[PDB]
């Protein structure tokens, strides 16, 4: 048991892992859930594992894009990332 510690090299390791566990992680990240990031402290601007906002944004590209809820949802996070107070959207027409 403990003799199977040739794993001091990371070659066979992480290879067995992506062979036998990647599926569950990629199937739960893309499923219905909520992001896990604090949104009060304005902290560190961000970190690297902290960029699950990408997954949170991809989760809504599923069906029946209403084109109004999605823009609102991306703006409600771009407001936090930029550290701004207000945001707005103007549309273009010709008469």
């Amino acid at each position: 048991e403990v003799e199977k510690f040739l794993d001091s090299n990371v070659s066979f390791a992480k290879q067995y892992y992506n062979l036998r566990y990647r599926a569950k992680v990629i199937s739960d990240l893309l499923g219905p859930r909520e992001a896990a990031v604090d949104f009060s402290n304005y902290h560190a601007l961000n970190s690297v594992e902290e960029s699950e906002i990408i997954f949170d944004l991809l989760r809504d590209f599923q069906d029946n894009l209403q084109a109004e809820k999605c823009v609102f949802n991306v703006m409600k996070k771009l407001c936090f990332l930029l550290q701004a107070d207000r945001m707005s959207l103007f549309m273009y027409r010709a008469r």
């Binding site: 599926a23 569950k24 990629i26 199937s27 893309l30 499923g31 991809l58 590209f61 599923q62």
Partner: protein
């Protein structure tokens, strides 16, 4: 060919394409836990194929 796993791609009530995943390498056949990875990962290619079909019309 020995094992097969396939699904369609739908725009409303119409079909646009079909995708196949022939020939699994280790198990005797595809397990039941892959059938959800398949659907949850093709959700992004569905959008691109729907955009292509709409642009063509």
């Amino acid at each position: 060919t020995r094992n097969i796993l396939a699904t369609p791609i739908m725009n409303g009530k119409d079909v646009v394409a079909v995708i196949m995943a022939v020939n699994k390498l280790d198990g005797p056949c595809f397990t039941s836990e892959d059938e959800d990875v398949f659907l949850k990962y093709l959700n992004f290619g569905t959008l691109n194929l729907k955009i292509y079909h709409l642009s063509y019309l």
